[PDB]
Amino acid sequence: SGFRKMAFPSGKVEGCMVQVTCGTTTLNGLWLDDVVYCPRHVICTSEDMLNPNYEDLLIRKSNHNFLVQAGNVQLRVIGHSMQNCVLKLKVDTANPKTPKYKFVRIQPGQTFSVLACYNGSPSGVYQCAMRPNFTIKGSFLNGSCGSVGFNIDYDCVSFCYMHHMELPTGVHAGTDLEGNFYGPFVDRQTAQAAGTDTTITVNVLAWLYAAVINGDRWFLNRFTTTLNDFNLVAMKYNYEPLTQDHVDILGPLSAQTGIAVLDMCASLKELLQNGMNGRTILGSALLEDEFTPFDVVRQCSGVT
Amino acid sequence: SGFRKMAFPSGKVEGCMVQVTCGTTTLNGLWLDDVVYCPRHVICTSEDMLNPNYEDLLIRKSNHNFLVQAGNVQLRVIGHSMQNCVLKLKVDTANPKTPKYKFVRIQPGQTFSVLACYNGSPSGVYQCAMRPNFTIKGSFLNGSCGSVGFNIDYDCVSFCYMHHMELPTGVHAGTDLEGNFYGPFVDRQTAQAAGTDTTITVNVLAWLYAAVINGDRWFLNRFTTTLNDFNLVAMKYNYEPLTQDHVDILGPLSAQTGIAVLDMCASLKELLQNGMNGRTILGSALLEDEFTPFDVVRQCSGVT
Ligand SMILES: *CCC(=O)N(C(=O)[C@@H]1CCOc2ccc(Cl)cc21)c1cncc2ccccc12
Ligand SMILES: *CCC(=O)N(C(=O)[C@@H]1CCOc2ccc(Cl)cc21)c1cncc2ccccc12
Numbered sequence: 001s002g003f004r005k006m007a008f009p010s011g012k013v014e015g016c017m018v019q020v021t022c023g024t025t026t027l028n029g030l031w032l033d034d035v036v037y038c039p040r041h042v043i044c045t046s047e048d049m050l051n052p053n054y055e056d057l058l059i060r061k062s063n064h065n066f067l068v069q070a071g072n073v074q075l076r077v078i079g080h081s082m083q084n085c086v087l088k089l090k091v092d093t094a095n096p097k098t099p100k101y102k103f104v105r106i107q108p109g110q111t112f113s114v115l116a117c118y119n120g121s122p123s124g125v126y127q128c129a130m131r132p133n134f135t136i137k138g139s140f141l142n143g144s145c146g147s148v149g150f151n152i153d154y155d156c157v158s159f160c161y162m163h164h165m166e167l168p169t170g171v172h173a174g175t176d177l178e179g180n181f182y183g184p185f186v187d188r189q190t191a192q193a194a195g196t197d198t199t200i201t202v203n204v205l206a207w208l209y210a211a212v213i214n215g216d217r218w219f220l221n222r223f224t225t226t227l228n229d230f231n232l233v234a235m236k237y238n239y240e241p242l243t244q245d246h247v248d249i250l251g252p253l254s255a256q257t258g259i260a261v262l263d264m265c266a267s268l269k270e271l272l273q274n275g276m277n278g279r280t281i282l283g284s285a286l287l288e289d290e291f292t293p294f295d296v297v298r299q300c301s302g303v304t
Numbered sequence: 305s306g307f308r309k310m311a312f313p314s315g316k317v318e319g320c321m322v323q324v325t326c327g328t329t330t331l332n333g334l335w336l337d338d339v340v341y342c343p344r345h346v347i348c349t350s351e352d353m354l355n356p357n358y359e360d361l362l363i364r365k366s367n368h369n370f371l372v373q374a375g376n377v378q379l380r381v382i383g384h385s386m387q388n389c390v391l392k393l394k395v396d397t398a399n400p401k402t403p404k405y406k407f408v409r410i411q412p413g414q415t416f417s418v419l420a421c422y423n424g425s426p427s428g429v430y431q432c433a434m435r436p437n438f439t440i441k442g443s444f445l446n447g448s449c450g451s452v453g454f455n456i457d458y459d460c461v462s463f464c465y466m467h468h469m470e471l472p473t474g475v476h477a478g479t480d481l482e483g484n485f486y487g488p489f490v491d492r493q494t495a496q497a498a499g500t501d502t503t504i505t506v507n508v509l510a511w512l513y514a515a516v517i518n519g520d521r522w523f524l525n526r527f528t529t530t531l532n533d534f535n536l537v538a539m540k541y542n543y544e545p546l547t548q549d550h551v552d553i554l555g556p557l558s559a560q561t562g563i564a565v566l567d568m569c570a571s572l573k574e575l576l577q578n579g580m581n582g583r584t585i586l587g588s589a590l591l592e593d594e595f596t597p598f599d600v601v602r603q604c605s606g607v608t
Contacts, residue, residue: 001474004443006428009419011315115313121608124310125429137587139308141606170305170519215474276589278579283441285580285589302445304425 003210003282005290006299007113008152010125015097018075019120020089020146021067028117028146029068029089030162030177032098036068036075036089037177038146039164040082041187049189058082063089069120070095084179085187086162100156103177108132109200109240111292112149112160116140129203129290130161132240133195134183135171138163149174154304167192199239200289202246205264206296207288209253211281213300219281220259223266230265237272249293256300307514307586309594310603311417312456314429319401322379323424324393324450325371332421332450333372333393334466334481336402340372340379340393341481342450343468344386345491353493362386367393373424374399388483389491390466404460407481412436413504413544415596416453416464420444433507433594434465436544437499438487439475442467453478458608471496503543504593506550509568510600511592513557515585517604523585524563527570534569541576553597560604 020029020038024045029038041049043057061080066089068075079090106112111129115122116139128136128149140147140163149161164187165173171194173185185192212220231241247261254261268287276285291299324333324342328349333342345353347361365384370393372379383394410416415433419426420443432440432453444451444467453465468491469477475498477489489496516524535545551565558565572591580589595603 001445001470002441002443002476004428004430004432004441005309006420006430006443007311009315009318009426009429010313011318011426014313014315116310118606118608122313122315123606123608124308124603125313126308126310128308137306137308139306139310139603141305141604143606166305172306275582280590286584299428299443300445302422302427302447304422304427 001214003214003299005127006295007125007127008150010113010115010122012099012152012157013115013148013150014122015099016095017115017117017120017122019069021069022061022065026119027143028120030146030148030159031068031070031075031091031095032101034091034094036091037086037162038089039162039175039187040085040087040179041145041164042066042087052188054082082179085164085175085181086177086179102156102158104158104160105176105178105180106130106160108134109203109292110160111203111290111295112151114138114147114149114161114163116144117147118143127290129200130182131171132198132200134181134185135167135173135194135197136161138172140166140172148177167194169194196238199237199287201234201239201242201268202249203289203292204239204268204287205242205246205250205261206253206293207282207291208264208268209250209257209259209293210291210296210300212257212259213296214282216281218279219267219271221267221270223270224260224263225266225269226262227265230262230269233269233272239272252297253293305518307518307603309431310599311429311431312454314417314419314426316403316456316461317419317452317454318426319403320399321419321421321424321426323373325373326365326369330423331447332424334450334452334463335372335374335379335395335399336405338395338398340395341390341466342393343466343479343491344389344391344483345449345468346370346391356492358386386483389468389479389485390481390483406460406462408462408464409480409482409484410434410464412438413507413596414464415507415594415599416455418442418451418453418465418467420448421451422447431594433504434486435475436502436504438489439471439477439498439501440465442476444470444476452481471498473498500542503541503591505538505543505546505572506553507593507596508543508572508591509546509550509554509565510557510597511586511595512568512572513554513561513563513597514595514600514604516561516563517600518586520585522583523571523575525571525574527574528564528567529570529573530566531569534566534573537573537576543576556601557597
C-alpha cells in the first residue's frame, strides 16, 4: 500500500546521456546506436535566439564544430543533419549501452519520466505529464536542454520528449524525438504564452481509484451521474471533458474497486463543488492529475 | 525554474538488485562486492511471522537454501550470517557493477530515493523522507521487501534504508544496511502503531525558499518572529521545533533570496494560522516537508 508519484528506473536512459557543445553553447544529447540527438538551438548564441534562421546558422557549422563527450571520452562526429527542431549527429561509435527503444509522440494527459541532466550528467528523475496546453511542468535550469522524457515497457524505452525551452511563466516546452514541438511552441526567444492548463479528468478519476485501493475512502458519496451532467460541472471547473473512451480505459480500476465509473464521477463532482474541507486524499490537498489509469494499475500491481 | 519531487538517478542502484528466495519466500537483495544484503524475514513462512525466533529458524537453513539470482543467472552462496534484522549472504562473485558506496543511518527529516523492486527487478523510483515517528510513507506491495533507500553524492551511493514491513496503517518500516530498524519497530506480525507524524519544519521552510526562488511569492508577509514565538505556534500545529541548528542550515537559502530565516518563519506562522485560502505554493495545496534544505540547493543549482 501507499501511492507515490513514481518515475521509471532511469538506468537505461542514463547510459544514453552525452554532452554536446557547439562553440560556446553546451547542452545534453541522447546517444542511441551511432546517432546523438540534441536540440538544434545548440548552434545558437544567446543573441541568435531572438530571431534564429537555423538553416542559415547550420551552414556555418561542420562535423568538427559539434563536440560530443560520453562520460569523459570524446566521440567522433562523422555526419550531421537537422530534422525539424533537433540535430542528429552521426558518430563513428554505436552506443554500447543502447537499450531497446522507440520514438513515440504522446497525447496530452499522458505521463512520462524525465531524467534531468546537465553537461551530459544526470541530476535527477521525476514524473510529469504532457499538459492539455502542450506544456510540461518540469524542473529545468539553464543547460538542462536535451534532457529526455520517456516511458519503459519491460526492456523497451519509448522516448517521448526532449527538453528545449522555458516559457516566461516557468512552464516548459519541448519536442518529440523527431524534433516536432508539442503544441504551438517555436525554438525562438519570443513571446509565447500558454493556453488554459485544464485538469486531466481521466487521470484524476484514476487517482481517486488509487485512493480507494489504498484505503482513503472518505470522499465516496451516495450519488451517481451521467457523462453529460458530469461534463457540465467539469467544464465549469476547467477539467477536460470525459468521453466514453476514458470510461472504457477506467474499466479495470472500476472492476478492481467495484465502484462504477459514473459513481466515481459523481464523487469527483461533489469534491469539485464542496472542496476538500481541509481534508486530504493520498496525502494531497488537491486533486492529482498526473497519474494515468495505466500508471495506477502498474503501481498498484507491481509491474517491473 | 519549476520545482519537482525529484529522486536521484537510479542506475547505480539498479545494477545492485538481485532476487533472494529461501524456500517459498522471495524478496529483493542488494548485491555489493561479494555480499548480498536482504531482510532476515526471507527465512520465514507467513505463519512464522506471528512470533519468529530468527536464530532458531536460521539453524534450519544452509548456504544452498538461499537462492540468489542476478538478472537471470544464479549466484553461488558460500556463507551466510545474520546482522541484526538483515542477512548477509556471501557469494563467490563480486558484483561487477558495485558502485562506490557507504552505509549510513539517517536522522528523521532526512530524505532519500527508494528504488521499489519486485523479484530483484526495478519497478520505479520515488523520493521520500524518514518521518519524525521513524516510518516512511512509501509505495510498497508484497515482495517489495529488500528494496533500498539511498542518496548519491557525485559517484558514491550512501544506502540508508532497506524495506521490511508495512504497518496496519499503510505506513512503512525498515532498517539501515546494518539491519537496525529505524524507530521502535520489530520484524514480527504484531500490533505496532506509529507515533505522531509531525511536520518537518526545517524542510517546509526550505520548500518555502524554493517557492520564492521559483516565483511563488504571494505568502511572503510583512512580519518577523523569534524562534520561541514561532515554536509555540509550531507545537500547536504538530510541527517539529525549529532550532538554531536548523536556522544555520537554512543560511544559504536565506542568502540566496535575501529573506531572513525568522521572516520566513513568520510567513509560515501566518500560513499555519490563516490556511492557504484555496491558493497553492509550487502546485501544492499543503505545505511540503519532504525536501531538505540540501535538496532545495541541489535542485535549484543543478548538481549532477
Ligand atoms: C537549455 C537552456 C535553454 O536554452 N533554455 C531556454 O529556454 C533558452 C533561453 C533563451 O530563450 C530560449 C528560446 C527558445 C528556446 Cl528553444 C530556448 C531558449 C532553458 C530551458 N529550460 C529551462 C531554463 C531555465 C533557465 C534558463 C534557460 C532555460
Ligand atoms: C515483502 C513483503 C512483506 O514481508 N511485507 C510485510 O509487511 C510482512 C507481512 C506480514 O507481517 C509482517 C511482519 C513483519 C515484517 Cl518485517 C514483514 C511483514 C510487506 C512490506 N511492505 C509492503 C507490503 C504490502 C502488502 C503485503 C506485505 C507487505
